[PDB]
Write a protein that binds this ligand. Structure first.
Ligand SMILES: Cc1ccc(CCc2c3nc[nH]c3cc3c(=O)[nH]c(N)nc23)cc1
Ligand SMILES: Cc1ccc(CCc2c3nc[nH]c3cc3c(=O)[nH]c(N)nc23)cc1
Ligand SMILES: [Zn+2]
Ligand SMILES: [Zn+2]
Lengths: 359, 359
């Protein structure tokens, strides 16, 4: 059948690439948007996807990784038979929960070994190494010390993953680059990860308050340090314009939680920029959320009706907004893939920004 | 094409009837459950219906009946091309908002004439007369005075409806019986409504705290006072067992808001009674919400997953619960219609109660 893990690049334009990841549970077209699976009914890729996210930090607390395993794993639990990616829980413990040491983080304990076992019990297909997302801003010394611990933890994550036969033979493991905003530390981190060897490489430690200009600056030198022949996952990013610029700099995978969060608060993404549907200017607007969007919501209902539902406190309004936002991001990713494949991505990015920041 | 309004009875068992209402926008199979249209995406009848409810009291306040008319009416607004029923707003003004007089109710003014015009602007197909839902309990004198005012208002509602050509020719008007729990006042009210003449007759003034035994007692003598050859709508009812007992007493139409409210609070309806999915006993339950339910939710997801979603605060959990509850009520109505048509409704009601109140 399909291999455990293959990445093939079908077309390139500058630093941008488009291709496919093959795994046992399915194919992932890249650049890929990976939505959380619990925010709406995600279908096989529209309000769908090739791969969804599990929420390791939440699941290890409710109902617990052992219970998820008892219930058949996340694929059975969520009714999703395609690939699933889980984070290692390190970022979320530090953001939401903490006592740190070389062994791991107490808050329950979380270590590289326990993080890998938790992701094993959940049954995810893409497993993230257990890292430390360095806070921003950070001094060079603090960023270096943090990156060095993350690299020791990456080696421990590799070894823990390899010691579980079912996981080593059926899942894939991604290493996470750290180093804050410092080119020399980003290089040393990429070097360390490449020596250990991973199936994919994530750019960690961004989307931590640095702003888009700084994030793009860091991606300019950081992504080329990663192995070219493996997928590149930018964690925590982001807005549609973040995605286009990150693809321009060689990123292949994205996890944006914004579209599934924005929907509950009334924010809809459109080709003309985001709008807040609760605003009174939409109370009589008979256009769909976006006039070109092909999602089920825009095929049927107006801005005026979704405005009404959300203002009325109807959960239906938020669900429709969420379904539209997920669909818009997937339509964005499809246009990105098509334009790279056709050698017109540079023009697309230009056209996208001009319209997105016009209105 | 179809007539403005026809009701045909296809089969009877005791006082129970099953049949069809024909209107210009579609056919309604009876006994019918009429869900609110804003609680989930309701499809053509499953998580669907032959007719949905509009919320007159909410709509006249946000965005206003004139604005709904400017947007094309509720059918265009909600994307629903089949029949729509609206209440007259009298109950809701008194429950949720008040100064009453023979002219109407100030809170905005609401009169029989204004209520009919509001329902005209909304474009509903079944229009309710403007009544006063008598509070419970009520003395005979207070119940009589209230019923008598409602009957004068029913005549004013009839005249207002008939004076709007588009409405008189394309919609239907239902009169509402009052009289609290008093047989002689229920009779006088039915007499008054029959002399005015309506397309259907509602039993009003119940589901106001009287309890199921008292409600059934009042239906025992009240429903036979209404014209047999016209549909009978019990307003505000109710639980599944309320519906079965009310069909046994000659009711044809129901509006239950409970299934669309219960879903948000974790209550699911099953053939074994209601359950609260948030209860810890469902955290590892791999069965669907109901093992016989044919809805999309029970085809795909477990109690354990819906429990997880709701406990996690995910709006998806409440939406799935709502979709299941709407579907369960429609499956209930289908079994009621089939069993009356097959002459086995008495046995069905017996079997239903024995299982529903067992667990
Ligand atoms: C469900 C879910 C969605 C997204 C994430 C990714 C969370 C996330 C970041 N989010 C913003 N910036 C981020 C940086 C890192 C990082 O450096 N390391 C890890 N392990 N995760 C990150 C985790 C869980
Ligand atoms: C959206 C919506 C749903 C349901 C209703 C029906 C509201 C309702 C009653 N609810 C409980 N008991 C009820 C009695 C009456 C009544 O006597 N008169 C009217 N006009 N409505 C009633 C109105 C609006
Ligand atoms: Zn859309
Ligand atoms: Zn169901």
């Amino acid at each position: 059948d399909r291999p455990r893990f293959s990445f093939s690049i079908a077309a390139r334009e500058g630093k941008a690439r488009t291709g496919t990841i093959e795994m046992k549970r399915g194919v992932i077209r890249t650049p890929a948007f990976m939505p959380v699976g619990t925010a709406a009914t995600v279908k096989a890729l529209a309000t769908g996807a090739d791969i969804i996210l599990g929420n390791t930090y939440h699941l290890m607390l409710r109902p617990g990784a052992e219970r998820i395993a008892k219930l058949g794993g996340l694929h059975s639990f969520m009714g999703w038979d395609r690939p699933i990616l889980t984070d290692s829980g390190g970022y979320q413990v530090m953001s939401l929960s903490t006592k740190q040491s070389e062994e791991g983080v107490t808050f329950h304990m979380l270590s590289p070994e326990r993080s890998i076992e938790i992701q094993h019990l959940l049954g995810s297909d893409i497993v993230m190494a257990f890292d430390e997302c360095t806070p921003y801003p950070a001094t060079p010394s603090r960023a270096a010390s943090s990156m060095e611990r993350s690299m020791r933890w990456a080696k421990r994550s590799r070894d823990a993953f390899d010691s579980r036969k079912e996981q080593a033979e059926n899942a894939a493991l991604f290493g996470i680059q750290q180093g804050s905003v410092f080119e020399n530390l980003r290089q040393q981190s990429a070097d360390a990860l490449a020596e250990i060897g991973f199936d994919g490489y994530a750019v960690g430690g961004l989307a931590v308050g640095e702003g888009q200009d700084e994030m793009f600056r860091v991606l300019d030198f950081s992504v080329p340090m990663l192995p070219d022949d493996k997928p590149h996952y930018l964690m925590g990013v982001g807005k549609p314009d973040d995605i286009v610029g990150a693809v321009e700099r060689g990123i292949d995978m994205f996890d944006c939680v914004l579209p599934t969060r924005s929907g509950r608060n009334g924010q809809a993404f459109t080709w003309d920029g985001p709008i807040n549907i609760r605003n009174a200017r939409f109370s009589e607007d008979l256009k769909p959320l976006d006039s070109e969007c092909h999602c089920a919501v825009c095929q049927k209902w107006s801005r005026a009706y979704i405005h009404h539902l959300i203002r009325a406190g109807e959960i239906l309004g938020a669900m429709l907004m969420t379904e539209h936002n997920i669909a818009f991001y997937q339509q964005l990713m499809q246009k990105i893939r098509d334009s790279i494949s056709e050698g017109r991505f540079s023009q697309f990015a230009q056209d996208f920004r001009a319209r997105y920041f016009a209105r």
